[PDB]
Ligand binder design. Structure first.
Ligand SMILES: [Cl-]
Lengths: 131, 8
């Protein structure tokens, strides 16, 4: 078969690997997907960042992924706004402790404490909309 | 050019 477009790192496998392509939904909106897969034995906390925070809905954008599990990130531009080839997305990932919390205040404290050399990052680029 | 926190 065809190999899946997936970036592989030591914490997460990310699909697609580099280029984000947006499609049209039956509910009348543009939408792309970012699938994260935790390939470690511990919880991986992740955050999603973008160069155009005013343009895109990103859900989830500040959460965590259980070991062995996958998380789908739904990205959709707001109505009337167009996708730009300069729009980029940043995936920040860091491995959490064995008995670490995943609630809002625990995630805030984790990212305030984690040393920056243990934070893995991967960038994605948006492609212009085709229809 | 820099990155900003995404919004749900
Ligand atoms: Cl179409």
């Amino acid at each position: 078969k065809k190999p899946l477009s997936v970036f592989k790192g030591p914490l997460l496998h990310i699909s697609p690997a580099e280029e984000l392509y947006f499609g049209s939904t039956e509910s009348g909106e543009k939408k792309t997907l970012i699938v994260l897969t935790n390939v470690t034995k511990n919880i991986v906390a992740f955050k999603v960042r973008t160069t155009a925070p005013e343009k895109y809905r990103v859900k989830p954008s500040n959460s965590s992924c259980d070991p062995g599990a996958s998380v789908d990130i739904v990205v959709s531009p707001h109505g009337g706004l167009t996708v730009s080839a300069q729009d980029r997305f940043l995936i920040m990932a860091a491995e959490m402790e064995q008995s670490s919390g995943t609630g809002p205040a625990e995630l805030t404290q984790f990212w305030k404490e984690v040393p920056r050399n243990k934070v893995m990052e991967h960038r994605l680029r948006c492609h212009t909309v085709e229809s | 050019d820099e990155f900003y926190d995404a919004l749900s």
